[PDB]
Design a protein around this ligand. Sequence first.
Ligand code: SF4
Ligand code: SF4
Ligand code: SF4
Ligand code: SF4
Lengths: 449, 438
Amino acid sequence: AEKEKNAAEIRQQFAMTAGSPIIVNDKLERYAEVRTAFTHPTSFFKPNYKGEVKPWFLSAYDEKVRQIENGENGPKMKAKNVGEARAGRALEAAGWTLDINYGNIYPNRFFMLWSGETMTNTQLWAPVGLDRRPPDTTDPVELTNYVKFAARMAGADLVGVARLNRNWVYSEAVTIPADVPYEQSLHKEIEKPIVFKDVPLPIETDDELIIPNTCENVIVAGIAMNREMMQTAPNSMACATTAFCYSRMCMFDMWLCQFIRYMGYYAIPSCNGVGQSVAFAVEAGLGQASRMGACITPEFGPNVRLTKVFTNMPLVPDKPIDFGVTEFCETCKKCARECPSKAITEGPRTFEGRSIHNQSGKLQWQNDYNKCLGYWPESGGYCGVCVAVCPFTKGNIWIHDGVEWLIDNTRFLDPLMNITEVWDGKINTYGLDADHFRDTVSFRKDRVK
Amino acid sequence: KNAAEIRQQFAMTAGSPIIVNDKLERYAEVRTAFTHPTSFFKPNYKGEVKPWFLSAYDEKVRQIENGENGPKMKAKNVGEARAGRALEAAGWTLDINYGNIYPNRFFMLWSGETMTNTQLWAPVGLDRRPPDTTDPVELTNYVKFAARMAGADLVGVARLNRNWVYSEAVTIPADVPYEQSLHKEIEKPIVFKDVPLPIETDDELIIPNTCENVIVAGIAMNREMMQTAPNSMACATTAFCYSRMCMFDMWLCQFIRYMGYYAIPSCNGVGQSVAFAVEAGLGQASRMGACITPEFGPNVRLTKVFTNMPLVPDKPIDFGVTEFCETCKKCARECPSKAITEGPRTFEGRSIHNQSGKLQWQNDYNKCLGYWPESGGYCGVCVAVCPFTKGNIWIHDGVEWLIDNTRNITEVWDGKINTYGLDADHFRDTVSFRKDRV
Ligand code: SF4
Ligand code: SF4
Ligand code: SF4
Ligand code: SF4
């Protein structure tokens, strides 16, 4: 008879001994955030469909408008009608409501405040003094259980803890000056160093973003995207599940930071800022790095968003996991073959960055991310084809052979041996799927050992 | 177990289920126990008279110092007591002054024009482009799909009944900063006029006469946590769901606006959620005063969005709640303040806090509020003990569905949890396909 899936059992089977899995060498240096394809001058500008050179997201807007008017849900993809085309883009746009300039990357601005003191919630609760009372709990075992419980309440589908590896913290952040209003923000972005100093609390000066030396840990959250919607990549509904999850990330960071502060510790939110989420997720045991460059998780594959919070709260680090992703990516290459921009390498892992957008000195598959970004204005979205076609994104990967869990190789055979339907089909709260939602149930035993 | 078949079976013909008489008038929001001068001030445990929530704060502090999770409920240790209150305080992060009631302030903006998201997306012009869809059937499917993405566990549609819209809102002057908001609350008429868009003047909150519909969302609370009522973990699931309400309202208003229509958010403001929920078919009114749903009983929060978007109203539902509450009276016997009546339904309010003129069980809500400073939380014992709150009250006799008439905090922290406090044992009940959306 079929053994009922046990996600906790699976994670237990593939747990590693302690130690950062990421292999590095001496050319490794912290990475300036302005180097990402979204922000770097070499990659920021892209032509629209008329050949006008614009900020990438503005060229993409032009393509969204053109598709709506032509009754399309994506590049060369006709919608049922213009109404459906419009609806897909209205959903996507609305998804982004609690996110600033596509990622919330500016530290200590807007939603990403490094202190809770000015927040309306903190002000309301000030007479209780939770943010000023010394911690009543210092035991990292109890704290790990409390904070992971809180993280699930705050919308995380996965949560893990790691010691903070400063190699993955950006050397300089992209931000704006404190006196710049939102409407001028995209015009006034600057760089600001992130430094570690012997200070009691996270603080920002005119010159630096200062993280205390006592900032020991990072809490990493996985925010699951919707499979049916992502499978429409590169079309509009894949853009919508992406967008909604960014707003979920933001609410997670704020909720969790407030809990940690009210427990008597400090907490730094980040969403897409501060440091490299994939590396933190790997070290916290959410999953493994992959050819496409994302963290692949046992539960969702790469079809999951990441955010993280940094804290001095004593915690128990989780163990990394090795469930064989590296070995499958070595032989699969489906993402590389399907990628519309040929951004993803079919070659071996190296320590040498492909371009300025990669951080050299760590062993990974080196992808050309200027090529990736270049496809976004052409398609009018955020693509995601690589996530959509990855076999680990399918719900059906895990089987039990009577002794242990293993990955079903039939899912990796190549060749294997619409959007109206998504709007008319299965949905549930936050786009979560009740057929698989049991996989992320949590009891104390799986929160702390 | 099949929730879609259950709702289908108990569907009623069209028409508001709420019985009213000629005495019924719209209710001034200031009259609620939270805000009215007769009920607002309560003593703390030292005998000092303060705003009710400040006195309740004093009890939270006392409990933490004394290692308690609630009134006369010892925690495992002071650390656990602290953790429950930290979780509760954190839950409220996206909520203003306990309920987001001030209309067109903070998160509850009646236009999307100044929002950072609207500004970022302005070159696409979705909020300026006339609607491409006017068909109420397709719009109902689209907006309900969006509602589920936005965090609703239940969603329904009703024509807007203006009887449940507050005659006058509690709000603050528009240029008063948050830090002065509690001390500068005022009362402001909500009026319906022939105008193109929702608008606020110095004198009035103006809703257009074209505002035909209300979309009501149910946001499920956590059963294990609510069952700790009146202790701190019940406060925590309450708090987190208020921030979920807020995000729902903003997400869905933005979707509706980007579809070419206008949308008014509300959370606990603007009007009476229970009446809207009943008219939208989410559930039935109960003895305790809450909307009881087939899926969650009363253990579910409500919010609503008002719009001119053409929509298909849902049918009201009758699964026998009224007859059950007739003989049950469990909430009423367990209520720590004896706020809930054991008597029959009437059209006459017990005090200023009730809206007279509608047939309901009339409860004393000043008595309810009085228990919150004494216990240091938001109680919820009535929700906790209600048989409809229990996991599976639904059975099937081989032809149809029917109600089964037969029917610590450390362990909660150490026990089952899942994303947003939802339960995979029951999460299938709220799965949705087009056929159940419209
Ligand atoms: S598609 Fe194949 S090669 Fe690419 S990330 Fe997924 S498993 Fe790895
Ligand atoms: S998002 Fe699209 S263009 Fe970018 S790497 Fe993935 S498949 Fe290629
Ligand atoms: S406890 Fe009993 S009387 Fe009270 S609301 Fe529930 S079913 Fe009705
Ligand atoms: S919340 Fe508590 S005091 Fe208020 S009515 Fe319910 S049981 Fe009674």
